[PDB]
Amino acid sequence: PNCYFPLQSYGFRPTYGVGHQPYRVVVLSFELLHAPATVCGPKKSTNL
Amino acid sequence: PNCYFPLQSYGFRPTYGVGHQPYRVVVLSFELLHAPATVCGPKKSTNL
Numbered sequence: 001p002n003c004y005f006p007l008q009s010y011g012f013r014p015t016y017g018v019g020h021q022p023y024r025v026v027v028l029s030f031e032l033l034h035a036p037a038t039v040c041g042p043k044k045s046t047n048l
Numbered sequence: 049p050n051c052y053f054p055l056q057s058y059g060f061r062p063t064y065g066v067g068h069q070p071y072r073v074v075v076l077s078f079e080l081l082h083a084p085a086t087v088c089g090p091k092k093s094t095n096l
Contacts, residue, residue, distance in 0.1 A: 018067040
């Protein structure tokens with residue numbers, strides 16, 4: 001008491017309610033500004 | 049595998065959490081534009 005270990009555990013078992021199941025979350029962050037883009041969609045490159 | 053039915057079930061039993069219970073949802077769509085009014089509120093017709 002008064003001395004708490006800062007981080008608590010996400011204990012996960014195959015039996016929880018929807019509010020407690022281990023949701024696998026990933027985030028994708030892009031930088032859509034003016035600079036050579038190394039990442040692009042699968043669109044084909046037509047002629048010029 | 050790799051051959052999935054597009055559609056699955058709302059398996060409903062009397063005992064789930066509130067997050068899974070069979071809620072009955074009905075939505076009402078209105079078109080509030082200048083056109084002959086066919087559906088109106090219960091307001092009475094007063095004299096002219």
